[PDB]
Amino acid sequence: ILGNIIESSILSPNRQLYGDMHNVGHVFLSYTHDPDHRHLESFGVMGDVATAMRDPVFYRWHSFIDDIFQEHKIKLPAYTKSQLTYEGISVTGIIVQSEGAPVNTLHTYWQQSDVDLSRGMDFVPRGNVFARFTHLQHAPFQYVIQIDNTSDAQRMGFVRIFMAPKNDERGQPMLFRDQRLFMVEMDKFLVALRPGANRIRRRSNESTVTIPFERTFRCGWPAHMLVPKGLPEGFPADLFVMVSNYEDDRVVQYCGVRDRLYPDRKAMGFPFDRLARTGVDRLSNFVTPNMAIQSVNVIHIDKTVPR
Amino acid sequence: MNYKKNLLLLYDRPREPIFMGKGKSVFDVPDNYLTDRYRPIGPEIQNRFGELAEERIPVRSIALPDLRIPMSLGRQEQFSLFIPRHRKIAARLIDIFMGMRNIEELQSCAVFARDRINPYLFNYALSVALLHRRDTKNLDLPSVVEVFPDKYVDSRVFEQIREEATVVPEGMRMPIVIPKDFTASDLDEEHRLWYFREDIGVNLHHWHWHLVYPFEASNRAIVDKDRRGELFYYMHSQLIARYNFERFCNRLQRVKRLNNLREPIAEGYFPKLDSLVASRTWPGRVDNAVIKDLNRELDQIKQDVSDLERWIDRIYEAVHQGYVVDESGNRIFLDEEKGID
Ligand SMILES: [Cu+2]
Ligand SMILES: [Cu+2]
């Protein structure tokens, strides 16, 4: 509801009262240079969805808007130990491995790619016109998750993978209240678990958050932007995985054909959308058996690799 | 009867004491009706001003309510119905005049009060009483320009009128030209609208509209007139429509609204008026003056700008919501018919 109210979709239960808050903000910010049209100038970059993200103010305005949503989320009751426990299932470890690189280590760098802008170049002599884009890229990797069943029956589960920064400015483990809002979704997929022990492996390119290269260059987050940049000296990060009970999360009807329903009953950003239950203070004591944490290190290298 | 015509003499020369004689008549006032400053020598006066009078109007000594509240406002002070305190004073005086239910008792109360209360206030209180009593109805009240020219004319003329009247004999007196386009020069583009803003006519229309349709009085009667709310909307709305028209005829754009009260006011205005009742001039407003929180202990004004802003925020909400809430907590709907009113 709140989403439709904020930004104003015709689905808003009362546009007249709660207004067109997000959208009107984009216009105000784009017209500071000529607000009464006396200079016969058009809107700046924040006035077009196509270009809005280029401006730094976008993130400030969208940051504010988020705080308003948060104000609602902090009113919701904390997820109980019960609610995010999966009776029987226990995740005992998660790791990541890239080719030619230590365990629990992600790498990033620059990479040139080519795009034919020929169809867009009006009144230009026909032919090919290739343009070379430089953009962030990450080395391919894969998650390896150790899950124990201890039930006696095949258990269905949702694998939910997020990643956040590890520490604060003072160099300690970030607290939950802070860290919960910095968790970026990395993957969410359905898995069938056999009784006893299960070794789950998942490639970076199978991510349900991402869409392939080919789609962008030739809706989905760009694949090459899946991993944060990190630092040359290495940037410390907590990798988190949760296995939830798919039977509860299931919805009887990038991810097949899009035109019907959102396939997860749980709230979006589900493990961390709400405040912590009493006693919980940091990630390492928020965890239930069916969750796991892992220290990852993100290394950047200022070099241009080919495709 | 005569009484109706005798009240109109009160409007004559508002600051000259009532015993000085109005038109070709004079009042035969009791000594307990004489003002405290003049009463101790009173006799020497009745004689002194007795001359040149055809008629003498008798006046009976009556009970007279307490005129404490009416007398609270200074005699040399300004009077505005916008100021909270003045509203309570006028409404109380109106109540006295209104309360004397015979035309002879009204005449006695008036004659007494006149020289004790603020002229501007007296004029208002009387005007309202006469216009809305049954015995005094359809009576032609003298134009307020003629009784209070100081609110309608450049102060410069007054010392010319005094000169002309003292030096030159009657009959040979030259008409005094009233300056026009005198409040600002051509550096201020606003000066072009003098013929509208400063026109005697339109200022009289505005004053009179608020006479017949006040927003504060007693009971519903003389405030509860059909669709006065819509009237207030429309009349004022037409003022700006007409103003915006006249703007276009002087190569100006449409008047810009007061978006928000914290931003400076670009257009100053020095009105060039001198109140002969207050014996001072009206203050001007400078360019880029800013609205400031009021604390006028005397006038009974303790209002912050944020108070105003809060009222506006709430009114907007109601208008968008489509309904208002009464004191009781119930909802009243701003429908097509009575919404505007
Ligand atoms: Cu936006
Ligand atoms: Cu008005």
Contacts of A271 (CB under 8 A, 6+ apart): A79, A84, A160, A162, A183, A240, A242, A291
Distances (CA, A) of B210 to B123, B144, B204: 14, 13, 10
Please indicate whether, in this complex, the C-beta atoms of B317 and A16 are within 8 angstroms of each other.
no
Contacts of B314 in chain A (CB under 8 A): none
User: Is B320 annotated as ligand-binding?
Assistant: no
User: Which residue of A lies nearest to B317 if distances are taken between CA atoms?
Assistant: A17
For residue A16, give the chain B residue with the closest CA: B320
B321: contact with A, CB 8 A cutoff: yes
In chain A, residues with a C-beta closer than 8 Å to the C-beta of B322 are 16
Residue with tokens 């919805």: A251
Tokens 């030619």: give the residue: A100
Q: How far is CA B321 from CA A16, A240, B326, in A?
A: 7, 46, 14
Q: Bridge-partner residues for A143, per DSSP?
A: A96, A202
Residue type, B240: I
- Copy the structure tokens of residue B43: 């006799």
User: What is the Cα gyration radius of chain B?
Assistant: 23
* Closest to B96 in 3D by CA, of B71, B75, B119, B60: B71
Answer whether A16 sits within 8 Å of B320, measured CB to CB. yes
A203 neighbors A142 (Cβ within 8 angstroms): yes
Quick check: B235 and B225 in contact, CB under 8 A? no
Buried b (16+ CB within 10 A) or exposed e, B7-32: bbbbbbebeebbbebbeebbbebbee
Asked whether the beta carbons of B135 and B56 are under 8 A apart, the reply is: no
Question: How many residues comprise chain B?
Answer: 341
Cβ neighbours of residue A136 closer than 8 Å, sequence gap 6 or more? A108, A109, A110, A111, A224, A225, A229
Token reading at A135: 């953009």
Considering Cα of A49, then A50, then A54, then A55, what sign does the dihedral take?
Answer: negative
Sole residue written with tokens 């969410």: A188
Q: How far apart are CA B9 and CA B24, in angstroms?
A: 10
Taking each helix axis as running N to C, give the angle between helix B84-99 and helix B119-132, from 0 to 180 degrees, rounded to the nearest 10: 50
Largest distance between two CA atoms of chain B: 70
Residues paired with A244 in a beta bridge: A158
Catalytic residue ranges of A:
7
Please choose, from the candidates B228, B226, B193, the residue with its C-alpha nearest in 3D space to the C-alpha of residue B209.
B228
Ligand 2: distance of its center to the CA of B222 in Å? 17
Tell how far CA A280 is from the center of its chain.
24
The verdict on A16 touching B (C-beta cutoff 8 Å) is: yes
DSSP per position, B157-184? GHHHHHHHHHHS-TTSPPPPPPP-S-S-
Nearest ligand to residue B235 Cα: 2
Contacts of B320 in chain A (CB under 8 A): 16-17
The values of phi and psi at residue A146, to 5°, are -105, 110
Q: Which whole-number Å values give the CA distances from A15 to A6, A9, A21, in the listed order?
A: 9, 8, 10
First to last CA, chain A: 44
Neighbours of A285 (CB within 10 A): 10
The CA–CA distances, whole Å, from A297 to A163, A178, A272, A292, B232 equal: 11, 20, 22, 17, 71
CB-based contact B296:B82 (threshold 8 Å): no
Sheet with A155-165: list strands edge to edge: A130-138, A105-116, A291-305, A235-245, A155-165, A184-193
Cα B268 to Cα A115: distance, rounded to the nearest angstrom: 61
**Closest CA in chain A for residue B256:** A36
Query: 């220290």: which residue's tokens?
Result: A295
Of B74, B121, B118, the C-alpha closest to B299 is B74
Minimal CA separation from B242 to chain A, in Å: 24
Distances (CA, A) of B228 to B41, B210, B231, B311: 50, 11, 5, 21
**DSSP 8-state assignment for residue B261:** T
- CA A172 to chain CA mean position, Å: 24
Residue type, B30: P
**What is the Cα–Cα distance from A285 to A264, expressed in whole angstroms?**
26
Q: Which ligand is nearest to the CA of B203?
A: 2
Which ligand neighbours the alpha carbon of A50 most closely? 1
Tokens of B165: 């009247």
- CA gap A87, A18 in Å, rounded: 43
Task: Specify the residue for token string 């009247």.
Answer: B165
**C-beta of residue B89 within 8 angstroms of C-beta of residue B73:** yes
The rounded Å distance from CA A237 to ligand 1 centre is 28
CB contact under 8 A, B317 and A17: yes
Alpha carbon distance B99, A132 (integer Å): 93
Nearest residue in chain A measured CA to CA from B314 = A17
Q: Is A13 on the interface with B (CB under 8 A)?
A: no
Instruction: Report which residue type is found at A50.
Output: A
Residues in chain B with CB shorter than 8 Å from the CB of A15 are none
Give the span between the Cα atoms of B307 and B313, in whole angstroms: 10
Is B206 labelled a binding residue? yes
Q: Which helix (H) or strand (E) holds B207?
A: helix B200-212
Q: Please state whether B272 falls in left (phi above 0), alpha (psi between -120 and 50) or beta.
A: left
CA-nearest of A98, A9, A93, A26 to A62 is: A26
Nearest to B121 by CA among B74, B153, B63: B74
Count CB neighbours of B144 within 10 A: 20
Dig out the tokens for B303 from the structure.
């209002």
- Beta bridge mates, A202: A143
Burial class, A141, CB count within 10 angstroms (exposed 0-12 / middle 13-18 / buried 19+): buried
d(CA A251, CA A264): 6
Distances, alpha carbon B150 to alpha carbons B78, B159, B181, in Å? 12, 12, 17
Residue A36 at interface with chain B, using a CB cutoff of 8 Å: no
* DSSP run (H or E) holding B311: helix B305-321
A64 burial (CB, 10 Å; 0-12 / 13-18 / 19+) is exposed
How many A from CA of A284 to the centre of ligand 2? Answer: 69
Q: Compute the distance between CA of residue A186 and CA of residue A159 in angstroms, rounded to an integer.
A: 10
CB contact at 8 A, A296 and A228 = no
Closest CA to B321 of A51, A34, A17, A194: A17
Residue of A nearest to B318 (CA): A17
Cα-to-centroid distance, B207 and ligand 2 (Å) = 8
Please list every residue in chain A whose beta carbon sits closer than 8 Å to the beta carbon of residue B317: 17
CA B275 to chain CA centroid, nearest Å: 12
- Phi, psi angle pair for B152, to nearest 5°: -140, 0
Q: Helix, strand, coil proportions of chain A in percent (round to 5)?
A: 20, 30, 45
Q: Measured in angstroms, how far is the CA atom of residue B216 from the centroid of ligand 2?
A: 14
Is B45 in contact with B19 (CB distance < 8 Å)? yes
- Cα separation, A259 vs A281, whole angstroms: 40
> Looking at CA atoms only, how far is residue B321 from chain A in angstroms?
6
CA distance B234 to chain A (A): 25
Resolution number, Å? 3.2
Q: Rounded to an integer, what distance in angstroms lies between the CA atom of residue A112 and that of residue B6?
A: 102
Number of CB pairs, chain A paired with chain B, less than 8 A apart: 5
The runs of H, that is alpha helices, within B64-173 are 68-72, 84-99, 103-113, 119-132, 144-147, 158-167
* Residue A172 tokens, joined: 């300690």
* Long-range contacts of B158-166, Cβ-Cβ distance < 8 Å, separation of 24 or more: B158/B274, B158/B276
Q: Which residue has the tokens 């003498």?
A: B56
Query: Quick one: closest CA in B to A15, which residue?
Result: B320
Which chain B residues contact residue A17 at CB under 8 A?
A: 317, 320-321
Which residues from B are below 8 Å from A16, CB to CB? 320, 322
- B191 marked as part of a ligand binding site: no
CA of B206 to the centre of ligand 2 (A): 6
Strands (E), A26-154: 90-98, 105-116, 130-138, 141-148
Provide the 8-state DSSP code for B277. T
Closest CA to B96 of B86, B83, B109, B81: B109
Identity of residue A211: I
Give the mutation candidate from A8, A12, A16 for the B interface (greatest B CB count, under 10 A): A16
CA A44–ligand 1 middle distance (angstroms) = 14
Beta pairing class for A291-305 and A105-116:
parallel
Residues B70/B92, Cβ–Cβ less than 8 Å: yes
What is the rounded CA–CA span in Å between residue A56 and residue A63?
Answer: 11
Q: Give the integer Cα–Cα distance in Å for B191 and B196.
A: 10
State the pairing for strand pair A130-138/A141-148: unpaired
* Of B187, B206, B27, residue with least CA distance to B111: B27
Residue B261 CB neighbours (<10 A): 14
Find residue B296's DSSP bridge partners: B301
Find the DSSP H helices in chain A: 2-5, 15-18, 21-30, 57-73, 176-179, 213-216, 246-249, 283-286
Measure the CA dihedral B304/B307/B313/B315, to 10°.
-130
Identify whether the C-beta of residue A209 lies closer than 8 Å to the C-beta of residue A187.
yes
CA angle B293, B297, B301 (to 5 degrees): 50
Tokens 């003045």 -> residue: B86
Q: How many CB atoms lie within 10 A of CB A94?
A: 23
Nearest ligand to the CA of A59 is 1
Residues in CB range of B205: below 8 A, 6 or more apart = none
